[PDB]
Amino acid sequence: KVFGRCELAAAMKRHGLDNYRGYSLGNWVCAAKFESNFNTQATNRNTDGSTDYGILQINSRWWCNDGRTPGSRNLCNIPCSALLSSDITASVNCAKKIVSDGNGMNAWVAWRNRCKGTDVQAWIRGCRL
RNA sequence: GCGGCUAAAGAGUGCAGAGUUACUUAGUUCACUGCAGACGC
Questions:
Q1: Of A2, A12, A43, A127, most Cβ neighbours within 10 A?
Q2: How many domains does chain A have?
């Protein structure tokens, strides 16, 4: 499914992505846009044969099982195909666990490239939440 | 009992809520529910 901007913001909050770990929902709305263009089917293959799944582009090298990455970890305990679904449940839990961890939100590249140090409020402007 | 209007403006608002993510550029304007008025033959 290709979420609209707000339709997403609403679904993200409604799972517990609003101001989780002290990061307002304007950072996750933006993160999904630059990462996947709100499209929950998006995929990109990296030069090393792993692939990025879902609305936030979560790597099969560590986080999920696609079958076609030998020496993959699957730390989120799911098939990478769950990261493609219209139901963002299993792409939030995993987006959560990635952030609740090491670099934190700097573990979000797209976020860290474009939205870190920007008024991430523009991304919620107009949205019935 | 079957249509347009009920916001100058606006893609979108007759008032009151609702929230099934449907629709949409998200919406005081939109799925659902209460009640509508002046009209047309």
A1: A12
A2: 1
Identify the experimental approach: X-ray
Instruction: Give CA angle at A56 (A34, A99), nearest 5°.
Output: 110
Of A88, A99, A102, A93, the residue nearest A42 (C-alpha): A88
Which residues, listed in sequence order, are joined to residue A55 by a DSSP beta bridge?
A: none
Distances (CA, A) of A6 to A30, A97, A102, A108, A110: 11, 24, 29, 21, 19
Q: Please give the residue range of the domain that contains residue A28.
A: 1-129
Entry resolution in angstroms? 2.7
Is the CB atom of residue A122 positioned under 7 angstroms from any atom of strand B?
Answer: no
Q: What CATH number does the domain containing A40 carry?
A: 1.10.530.10
CA angle A17/A28/A34 to nearest 5° reads 155
A2 CB-to-strand B distance under 7 Å? no
Q: Å between A82 CA and B41 C1'?
A: 59
Tell me whether strands A58-59 and A43-45 are parallel, antiparallel or unpaired: unpaired
